Design a protein around this motif. Structure first.
Motif, mmCIF file in Angstrom:
data_model
loop_
_atom_site.group_PDB
_atom_site.id
_atom_site.type_symbol
_atom_site.label_atom_id
_atom_site.label_comp_id
_atom_site.label_asym_id
_atom_site.label_seq_id
_atom_site.Cartn_x
_atom_site.Cartn_y
_atom_site.Cartn_z
ATOM 1 N N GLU A 74 0.987 -5.787 -20.518
ATOM 2 C CA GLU A 74 0.328 -7.032 -20.920
ATOM 3 C C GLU A 74 0.281 -8.044 -19.776
ATOM 4 O O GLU A 74 0.432 -9.250 -19.981
ATOM 5 C CB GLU A 74 0.998 -7.638 -22.157
ATOM 6 N N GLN A 75 0.068 -7.549 -18.562
ATOM 7 C CA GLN A 75 -0.120 -8.381 -17.382
ATOM 8 C C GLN A 75 -1.470 -8.065 -16.751
ATOM 9 O O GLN A 75 -2.179 -7.148 -17.173
ATOM 10 C CB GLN A 75 1.013 -8.171 -16.367
ATOM 11 N N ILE A 76 -1.825 -8.835 -15.726
ATOM 12 C CA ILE A 76 -3.095 -8.629 -15.036
ATOM 13 C C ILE A 76 -2.947 -7.444 -14.092
ATOM 14 O O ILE A 76 -2.057 -7.426 -13.236
ATOM 15 C CB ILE A 76 -3.537 -9.889 -14.276
ATOM 16 N N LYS A 77 -3.820 -6.452 -14.250
ATOM 17 C CA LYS A 77 -3.825 -5.257 -13.419
ATOM 18 C C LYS A 77 -5.178 -5.132 -12.735
ATOM 19 O O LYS A 77 -6.219 -5.173 -13.399
ATOM 20 C CB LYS A 77 -3.530 -4.005 -14.249
ATOM 21 N N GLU A 78 -5.159 -4.979 -11.415
ATOM 22 C CA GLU A 78 -6.364 -4.823 -10.617
ATOM 23 C C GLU A 78 -6.276 -3.526 -9.826
ATOM 24 O O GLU A 78 -5.196 -3.137 -9.368
ATOM 25 C CB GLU A 78 -6.558 -6.010 -9.666
ATOM 26 N N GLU A 79 -7.416 -2.857 -9.671
ATOM 27 C CA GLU A 79 -7.482 -1.572 -8.990
ATOM 28 C C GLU A 79 -8.512 -1.643 -7.876
ATOM 29 O O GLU A 79 -9.661 -2.033 -8.109
ATOM 30 C CB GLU A 79 -7.834 -0.447 -9.969
ATOM 31 N N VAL A 80 -8.100 -1.264 -6.670
ATOM 32 C CA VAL A 80 -8.984 -1.194 -5.514
ATOM 33 C C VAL A 80 -9.354 0.267 -5.301
ATOM 34 O O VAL A 80 -8.473 1.125 -5.161
ATOM 35 C CB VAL A 80 -8.323 -1.788 -4.261
ATOM 36 N N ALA A 81 -10.655 0.548 -5.275
ATOM 37 C CA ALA A 81 -11.131 1.922 -5.208
ATOM 38 C C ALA A 81 -10.741 2.573 -3.886
ATOM 39 O O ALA A 81 -10.534 1.902 -2.871
ATOM 40 C CB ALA A 81 -12.649 1.968 -5.386
ATOM 41 N N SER A 82 -10.632 3.905 -3.912
ATOM 42 C CA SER A 82 -10.265 4.647 -2.709
ATOM 43 C C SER A 82 -11.302 4.483 -1.608
ATOM 44 O O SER A 82 -10.961 4.543 -0.421
ATOM 45 C CB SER A 82 -10.073 6.126 -3.044
ATOM 46 N N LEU B 143 2.234 -7.465 -5.620
ATOM 47 C CA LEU B 143 2.804 -8.138 -6.780
ATOM 48 C C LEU B 143 2.751 -9.641 -6.557
ATOM 49 O O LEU B 143 3.236 -10.132 -5.535
ATOM 50 C CB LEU B 143 4.251 -7.693 -7.009
ATOM 51 N N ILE B 144 2.166 -10.370 -7.504
ATOM 52 C CA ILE B 144 2.117 -11.827 -7.440
ATOM 53 C C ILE B 144 2.641 -12.386 -8.754
ATOM 54 O O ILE B 144 2.165 -12.000 -9.829
ATOM 55 C CB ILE B 144 0.694 -12.347 -7.154
ATOM 56 N N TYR B 145 3.617 -13.290 -8.673
ATOM 57 C CA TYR B 145 4.186 -13.852 -9.892
ATOM 58 C C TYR B 145 4.884 -15.163 -9.566
ATOM 59 O O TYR B 145 5.395 -15.327 -8.454
ATOM 60 C CB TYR B 145 5.168 -12.869 -10.550
ATOM 61 N N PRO B 146 4.926 -16.104 -10.502
ATOM 62 C CA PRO B 146 5.646 -17.358 -10.263
ATOM 63 C C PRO B 146 7.155 -17.174 -10.349
ATOM 64 O O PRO B 146 7.665 -16.198 -10.899
ATOM 65 C CB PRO B 146 5.139 -18.271 -11.386
ATOM 66 N N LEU B 147 7.868 -18.151 -9.787
ATOM 67 C CA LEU B 147 9.325 -18.186 -9.815
ATOM 68 C C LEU B 147 9.856 -19.170 -10.851
ATOM 69 O O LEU B 147 10.908 -19.785 -10.643
ATOM 70 C CB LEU B 147 9.872 -18.528 -8.429
ATOM 71 N N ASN B 148 9.149 -19.329 -11.965
ATOM 72 C CA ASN B 148 9.536 -20.276 -13.003
ATOM 73 C C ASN B 148 10.353 -19.563 -14.073
ATOM 74 O O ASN B 148 9.950 -18.507 -14.572
ATOM 75 C CB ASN B 148 8.299 -20.926 -13.624
ATOM 76 N N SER B 149 11.503 -20.145 -14.422
ATOM 77 C CA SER B 149 12.366 -19.549 -15.433
ATOM 78 C C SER B 149 11.763 -19.624 -16.829
ATOM 79 O O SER B 149 12.205 -18.891 -17.720
ATOM 80 C CB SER B 149 13.736 -20.229 -15.423
ATOM 81 N N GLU B 150 10.768 -20.486 -17.040
ATOM 82 C CA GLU B 150 10.129 -20.609 -18.342
ATOM 83 C C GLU B 150 9.108 -19.513 -18.610
ATOM 84 O O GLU B 150 8.669 -19.364 -19.756
ATOM 85 C CB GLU B 150 9.456 -21.979 -18.469
ATOM 86 N N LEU B 151 8.719 -18.746 -17.592
ATOM 87 C CA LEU B 151 7.756 -17.663 -17.742
ATOM 88 C C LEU B 151 8.380 -16.289 -17.556
ATOM 89 O O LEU B 151 8.162 -15.393 -18.377
ATOM 90 C CB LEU B 151 6.599 -17.847 -16.748
ATOM 91 N N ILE B 152 9.158 -16.098 -16.492
ATOM 92 C CA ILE B 152 9.824 -14.832 -16.207
ATOM 93 C C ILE B 152 11.318 -15.097 -16.089
ATOM 94 O O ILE B 152 11.737 -15.985 -15.337
ATOM 95 C CB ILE B 152 9.282 -14.178 -14.923
ATOM 96 N N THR C 162 1.159 -13.209 -16.808
ATOM 97 C CA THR C 162 1.735 -14.017 -15.744
ATOM 98 C C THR C 162 2.107 -13.216 -14.504
ATOM 99 O O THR C 162 2.694 -13.784 -13.577
ATOM 100 C CB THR C 162 2.974 -14.776 -16.245
ATOM 101 N N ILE C 163 1.791 -11.924 -14.458
ATOM 102 C CA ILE C 163 2.051 -11.082 -13.297
ATOM 103 C C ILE C 163 0.743 -10.421 -12.886
ATOM 104 O O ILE C 163 0.053 -9.826 -13.724
ATOM 105 C CB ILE C 163 3.130 -10.023 -13.590
ATOM 106 N N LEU C 164 0.401 -10.530 -11.605
ATOM 107 C CA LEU C 164 -0.773 -9.870 -11.052
ATOM 108 C C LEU C 164 -0.312 -8.657 -10.253
ATOM 109 O O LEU C 164 0.508 -8.786 -9.335
ATOM 110 C CB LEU C 164 -1.583 -10.828 -10.177
ATOM 111 N N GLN C 165 -0.842 -7.487 -10.606
ATOM 112 C CA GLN C 165 -0.435 -6.213 -10.027
ATOM 113 C C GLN C 165 -1.680 -5.529 -9.482
ATOM 114 O O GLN C 165 -2.520 -5.062 -10.256
ATOM 115 C CB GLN C 165 0.247 -5.336 -11.078
#
Lengths: 161, 37, 309, 313, 40
Positions: free
Chosen positions: C161-169, C250-259, C300-303
């Protein structure tokens, strides 16, 4: 050959895949209540380390020599070269660990058999297998000696083909 | 540090082994002292 | 206890020589909160409040006042217990193996209990860091023969349930395409009112090498930092390189209220009281550790995964 | 420790009832020196000096003086650790097997730990004495099924590079031929500058019985033992000669000097039996204990031991 | 059996056996009868 095998001019260069060493700890998964026995081995005939061995009662002592699955007493897991003593896990006990093979291309899950040299080979060679041996990993070469992770659990009821 | 001395009290197995070795050495010395060929 | 347990005494004496885990650099000090559980599941309840209507003006006499409602959400986290066994020399036998400037059998690869425990703890800490970063447990470079894990046991790279992005080969070497995918993921990112927080990005060595290339006198790293500052209210943006990742960003905030990381207080390696002994000079010892405890809010996580084939 | 280890307490209490090894009578007090090792090898370096030229006369002014050079030799010895296991009765279970005259289970051959340890130690000391005397370890009267030992581990009977003589089968009863062989071996002996030292001879019971016959027409007031003593005194600078009888030997005569400069015994300080800390326990009344002992450590100069073997077949 | 060389790991070790012998001594009673003159 030997297990330890030397002064180095420089040191050798993650945690993954660091177990691929000839002198690694043989038992992938050990367990107390595993029976380990000591025997003498021939110091000039065949080096029994990580090989299937058989009992040869000589006129002076009982030795262990590399042997086939038909007359296998157990697996030699360690050797003390100072005393030329081989440590044997009897075939009555389970084993899961790395053993010496002669085929550099063996896949996972294949059925295996021990040959006359105490060496893991594919069970399709033709001799009827009498032991349950399965490949838990692909064979890897240390540069040269080929090793493979195997699970050995007792004898097979009826010899296969 | 020998088992001959009743006042000696070992604390651990290492001290016990050392006391056994010292007792063996003292017994050999006493035997050689008392030996008359 | 120390008068009887030499192994415990040695563990206490040498416990300070184990280096701190590298996973601490990926979290803020407030994001980590220890819990008291070895094996099992823990349910965390989060409470929230909301306004039912506009506030009521206090004038003259009035009895009907606007109300404030409340809501709750329950999240279950699973914790697993794992063990390792290692062989070592015996205390009463170390005197017969104390050589010049070193102790132990070089031929037999036998070590004193303290050194063996230190090395085993270092290896287990490396494994724990890998599990925390990725979410999978494996000892092979190919990442195969993975140990099957329980549900509700996720890492940063496999959190659902996070943001997932795929870069083609076909676009694996096109930094413009990779950055376009990153921008799309950042746009899909949802932080709400907690946007004003520092951000953390973790990249593989290949992506790190590609980042320092000139932008197409500006760098791709600088452009990415500016883009992330555009969304995080221009807070701090930290960039890290890890060899445990392969073609992953991996991109994600350092906020204790989210992760939030709620690890077991026994997660780090701990000696076991049971020690195998026999008539020989070789003894066996056990080390326990605990895995699990990462919680994150949705989206809240971009992968970003760059396919190679 | 004694308040927690009943087995250690019993070992300490009963250790004094074990007799001393018989190998102590085959060596002088100075010949034995303990070493601190259990298994492995130990090196000993011997230094020697020599003169390079004739002396230089000191007169007026002289700058060139004759020199003295040096040399060294290294000897490596091996030590091996061995262990036995024995079953016995649990400490808390002795009261249920106590009897009016003894303690233990006769029908099952179960003994108290103290008695079992004493018997095991006696057997181990017998084996150690046999190994020290012969150079081999075996539990058979035939001498076969020998345990393979490490190199540089020898006894007084199998030490290499010594003088060996063989009395033929047809002369197995000819004391004159035996003495001819003994004289040949004594002449072949090379003691160097340490010849003025007492000598020790060990013989089998049959040889000892033959040695007390009148000297041979038979002669009075003199025995074969006296003739042998005179022959040995002819080479040992008229020093003392000691004679011992050992049942371990068989048709063998062993002659060697009792000088530490030629033959030395550097045994491990743990050579004699020592109990092990590990004790096997279970829900039953039977326990197991272990005993350790170290073998090795005999050094001798070459061509200083005479071994005469009388052939039977 | 022959001694076990304690090196590396081993749990199968040669044992020392014990035995008990029971020594029995038998005592038997025997009698003779002889004739004589009452109080040739």
């Amino acid at each position: 050959y030997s297990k330890s095998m030397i002064e180095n001019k420089v040191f050798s260069s993650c945690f993954k895949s660091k177990n691929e060493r000839v002198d690694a700890y043989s038992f992938a998964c050990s367990s107390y209540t595993d029976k380990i026995e000591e025997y003498l081995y021939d110091p000039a005939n065949s080096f029994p380390y990580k090989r299937g061995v058989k009992l040869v009662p000589k006129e002076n002592s009982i030795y262990v020599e590399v042997g086939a699955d038909t007359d296998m007493y157990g697996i030699c897991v360690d050797v003390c070269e100072f005393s030329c003593t081989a440590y044997v896990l009897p075939i009555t006990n389970n084993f899961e660990g790395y053993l010496v093979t002669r085929n550099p291309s063996i896949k996972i899950g294949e059925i295996l058999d021990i040959n006359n040299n105490g060496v893991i080979i594919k069970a399709g060679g033709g001799p009827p297998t009498a032991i349950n041996i399965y490949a838990l990993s692909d064979s890897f070469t240390i540069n040269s000696i080929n090793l493979i992770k195997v699970a050995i659990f007792g004898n097979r009821g009826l010899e296969k083909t | 540090a020998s088992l001959l001395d009743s006042n000696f009290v070992p604390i651990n197995f290492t001290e016990f082994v050392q006391a056994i070795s010292n007792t063996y050495k003292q017994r050999r010395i006493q035997f050689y002292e008392n030996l008359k060929r | 206890l120390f008068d009887e347990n030499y192994y415990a005494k040695a563990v206490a004496n040498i416990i300070g020589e184990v280096k701190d885990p590298i996973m601490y650099k990926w979290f803020s000090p407030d994001q980590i909160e220890d819990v008291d559980l070895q094996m099992g599941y823990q349910k965390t309840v989060k409470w929230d409040a909301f306004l039912n209507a506009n506030p009521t003006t206090i004038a003259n006499e009035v009895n009907t006042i606007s109300t404030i409602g409340f809501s709750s959400e329950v999240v279950r986290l699973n914790y697993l217990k794992l063990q390792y066994k290692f062989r070592h020399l015996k205390q009463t036998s170390e005197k017969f193996y104390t050589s010049d400037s070193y102790i132990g059998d070089i031929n037999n690869n036998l070590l004193p209990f303290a050194q063996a425990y230190k090395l085993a703890s270092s290896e287990i800490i490396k494994l724990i860091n890998h599990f925390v970063l990725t979410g999978t447990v494996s000892i092979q470079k190919d990442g195969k023969n993975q140990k099957r894990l329980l549900p509700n046991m996720y890492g940063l790279l496999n959190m659902p349930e996070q943001i997932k992005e795929e870069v083609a080969s076909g676009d694996k070497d096109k930094m413009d395409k990779i950055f376009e995918k990153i921008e799309a993921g950042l746009s899909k990112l949802e932080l709400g009112d907690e946007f004003s927080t520092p951000m953390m990005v973790i990249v593989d060595p290949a992506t790190s090498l590609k980042l320092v290339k000139p932008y197409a006198c500006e760098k791709w790293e600088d452009v990415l930092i500016q883009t992330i500052k555009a969304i995080n209210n221009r807070e701090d943006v930290y960039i890290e390189t890890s060899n445990l990742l392969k073609h992953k960003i991996l991109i994600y905030p350092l906020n204790s209220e989210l992760i939030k990381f709620k690890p077991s207080k026994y997660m780090l390696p701990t000696p076991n009281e049971q020690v195998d002994k026999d008539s020989t000079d070789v003894a066996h010892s056990y080390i326990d550790f605990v895995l699990g405890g990462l919680l994150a809010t949705r989206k809240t996580i971009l992968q970003v995964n760059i396919k190679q084939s």
